[PDB]
Amino acid sequence: VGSEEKILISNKPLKFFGKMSYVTPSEVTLEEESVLADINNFEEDTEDLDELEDIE
Amino acid sequence: MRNKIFISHATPEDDDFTRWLSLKLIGLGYEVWCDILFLDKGVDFWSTIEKEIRENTCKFLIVSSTAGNKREGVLKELAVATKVKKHLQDDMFIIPLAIDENLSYDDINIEIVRLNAIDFKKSWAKGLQDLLDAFEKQNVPKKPPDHSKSNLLYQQIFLHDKQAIEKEE
Amino acid sequence: MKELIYIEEPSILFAHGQKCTDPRDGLALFGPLNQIYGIKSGVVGTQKGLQIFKSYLDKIQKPIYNHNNITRPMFPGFEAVFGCKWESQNIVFKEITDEEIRRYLFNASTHKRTYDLVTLFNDKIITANKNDEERVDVWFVIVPEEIYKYCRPNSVLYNYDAQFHDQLKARLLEHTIPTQILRESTLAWRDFKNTFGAPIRDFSKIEGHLAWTISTAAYYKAGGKPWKLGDIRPGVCYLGLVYKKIEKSKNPQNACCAAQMFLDNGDGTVFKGEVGPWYNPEKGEYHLKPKEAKALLTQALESYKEQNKSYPKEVFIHARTRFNDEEWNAFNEVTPKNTNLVGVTITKSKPLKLYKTEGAFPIMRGNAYIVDEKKAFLWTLGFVPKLQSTLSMEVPNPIFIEINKGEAEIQQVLKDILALTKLNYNACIYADGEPVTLRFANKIGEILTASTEIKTPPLAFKYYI
């Protein structure tokens, strides 16, 4: 910002710690979140077909 | 005095239906015994089933599912239910429950063959209705309906690992 | 050093005065608060759509399962979950000839095709319910997939809207008929595949959610109330105010504002806010001139008086834009001295992505970040332990709330909008980011903007969702 004056931005972000929290299960719930991605896929869609056929 | 309703079913392929039926029974007034909400980890299993079957079980409910007719445990519970129904000399002790259409009527175990298995396949509301009216026409002692006990049980067991905890994160 | 305060997960009432947190499990365990005697389904479409709908309804009659009940619970059957009866008999069916579809296909511009098809469905429904003696509570429009695909607004071979269901509900609004449009591929995905040979509308694992949503929409449009809110104070009125703008060409959009109102239950009484030719689309700052502001406030107060007989003690206003001084001054003097008026703005464009140090888990839903007395954050999206999954996708993003005018507790409005986020009816999800007063806002604005020719829309909700 200046030939003599420089502005320092920290490279680590500001942290927030939470009083309440949750349990930590196994990795199956991330697979179920991928199934939730599929939920958002198969719920609704709009003008997907032409770009889908353009990708091959 | 015996008033408890025993439900015999396979696990874990019949968790949801047994849970729903037990919750509806316990909220409707009848006292229901099921291994989902009573038989938990760290305790002995078989002695409690035998004692409650031949001491305080008034009606026996066996699920004649596809996997509920070949497991050893359900067959053994059916055998002791047959023994206690022979001792009690009541043919209405065992009320079979059929929930799967893919299991034909001729492939069931034998104690379900003689008794007409209840209908729970295409729908559940009328099945519960005929189970209820058969119960009250068989004169099972009852308590007034209250879902508060059902609500307390549902908050007790089915919310043990699915709740937020008080830890620093 | 600031922390993130916690707001408890709000509760929804159920049958026999029972309190739960999940709508699906609470419905499966208890059911609706009020019972209806029975519904009668009506269908319009081809005979292929008729048999597809019949197959899907009898499948819904059976108890259908999913992968696991932890996230997506199983469907115990419509009768066992609602206490109402669904049957494949006494169903009124009206056929649409595919030859007429072929005749309408070869038109040049798809807009007139959309208009003629929409009007054909509309007057078919009007003729059907104006002659048939059999009452039809909900009409099921089974639109074909190729109609939804090849007759899109930008498909390549003014107040009327190019969207099918928008115009459908807009021109069906003037006769009080609860209708619900069903896409064919949604309930005919078994025989529907893509060009590669796969179902792009796949529900090989997730059809239980489809059954849940369809069943609860059918019960809600019938007339019965599935669930309501637990605690509502004696004299608090929510006013979710729409501030969605259309892009209506040289026609003066100005302010296409509408308003939702929750007072004692989940009942929404939407009264049509004015089109208001003042402040032409060059002036689109949503600054309500005093006469329309006091008219809308009088509408809300009269609805509250009709439904409650008592003057409300506090008015909650939900919107998404900033509020200027003169609009609130117009909002003030009409209100009595005893009541209180407060305005809340909800926005998404503010970025705040809270990440997690260890593991691969998102922010648990319910965290509240308070910046000042006025401004605050609420994490309505993310992980919820009752689901054992995240409702959000990738990283959740919160809704930046800010009270403009009036004195109120910030945690009070935080928990109140958290309770308001649970009342979604068209989709039986656990919760959504925007509150349902703002979730229904854009859709009901799209419904109302598709037909200027009406003057007194019904204030119910069955003819909208």
* Cis upstream peptide for B12 (omega within 30°): yes
Burial zone of C105 (CB within 10 Å; 0-12 exposed, 13-18 middle, 19+ buried): middle
Helices C110-131 and C98-105 meet at what angle, rounded to 10? Answer: 150
Which of B26, B53, B48 lies closest to B146 in space, CA to CA? B26
Separation in Å, CA C260 to CA C80, C206, C297, C436: 32, 32, 12, 9
Selected for mutation to probe chain B from C68, C79, C388 (highest B CB count within 10 Å) is: C79
Among chain B residues, CA nearest to A15: B169
Instruction: Return d(Cα C45, Cα B163) in angstroms, integer.
Output: 46
Determination technique for this entry: cryo-EM
Instruction: Return d(Cα C447, Cα C450) in angstroms, integer.
Output: 6
CB atoms within 10 A of CB C78: 26
Nearest by CB to B168, which of A17, A22, A23? A17
Cα of A7 to nearest chain C Cα, Å: 23
Pairing between β-strand B57-63 and β-strand B4-8 as defined by DSSP bridges: parallel
Q: Is C68 on the interface with A (CB under 8 A)?
A: yes
Q: Is C364 on the interface with A (CB under 8 A)?
A: yes
The dihedral of CA C211, C213, C216, C222: what is its sign? Answer: negative
Cα of C245 to nearest chain A Cα, Å: 21
List the alpha helices (DSSP H) in chain B: 15-28, 46-55, 72-88, 110-114, 125-137, 147-156
Selected for mutation to probe chain C from B162, B163, B166, B168 (highest C CB count within 10 Å) is: B162
Separation in Å, CA C356 to CA A11, B165, C381: 17, 17, 15
Residue type, C362: P
Which of C313, C55, C50 lies closest to C207 in space, CA to CA? C55
Q: Give the CA count within 13 Å in the CB-facing half-sphere of C14.
A: 22
Separation in Å, CA B50 to CA B33, B59, B83: 12, 14, 11
Q: Is B165 on the interface with A (CB under 8 A)?
A: yes
Q: Is C28 on the interface with B (CB under 8 A)?
A: yes
> In units of Å, what resolution does this entry have?
3.4
Nearest by CB to C80, which of B124, B154, B159? B124
Token pair of C60 as six digits:
């819904």
Phi, psi angle pair for B101, to nearest 5°: -75, -25
Size of the A and B interface in Cβ pairs below 8 Å: 21
Burial zone of B50 (CB within 10 Å; 0-12 exposed, 13-18 middle, 19+ buried): middle
Which residues does A contribute to its contact with B (CB < 8 Å)? 17-23
Contact residues, chain C, for A37 at CB < 8 Å: 393
Which residues of A make up each annotated binding site for Mg(2+)?
48
Instruction: Return d(Cα C28, Cα A38) in angstroms, integer.
Output: 24
Give SS3 for B4: strand
Enumerate residues 6+ apart whose C-beta is below 8 A from C212: C24, C73, C75, C428
> Inter-chain contact A36–C383, Cβ cutoff 8 Å?
no
Separation in Å, CA A25 to CA B41, C134, C361, C388, C389: 19, 53, 10, 9, 10
Enumerate residues 6+ apart whose C-beta is below 8 A from C243: C255, C257, C286, C319, C320, C321, C441
Per 3-state DSSP, what percentage of chain A is helix, strand, and coil (rounded to 5)?
A: 40, 5, 55
Nearest by CB to A22, which of C201, C354, C383? C383
Pairing between β-strand C5-6 and β-strand C12-13 as defined by DSSP bridges: unpaired
Residue type, B110: I
Per 3-state DSSP, what percentage of chain B is helix, strand, and coil (rounded to 5)?
A: 45, 15, 45
Instruction: Return d(Cα C73, Cα C63) in angstroms, integer.
Output: 11
Given the structure tokens 């719930």, which residue do they identify? A29
Q: Are B39 and B48 in contact (CB under 8 A)?
A: yes
Q: Is C169 annotated as a binding residue?
A: yes
Containing H/E element for B7?
Answer: strand B4-8
Q: Are C254 and C273 in contact (CB under 8 A)?
A: no
Burial zone of C127 (CB within 10 Å; 0-12 exposed, 13-18 middle, 19+ buried): exposed
The dihedral of CA B149, B153, B156, B161: what is its sign? Answer: negative
Selected for mutation to probe chain B from A20, A26, A29, A32 (highest B CB count within 10 Å) is: A20
Phi, psi angle pair for C395, to nearest 5°: -110, 125
First to last CA, chain C: 45
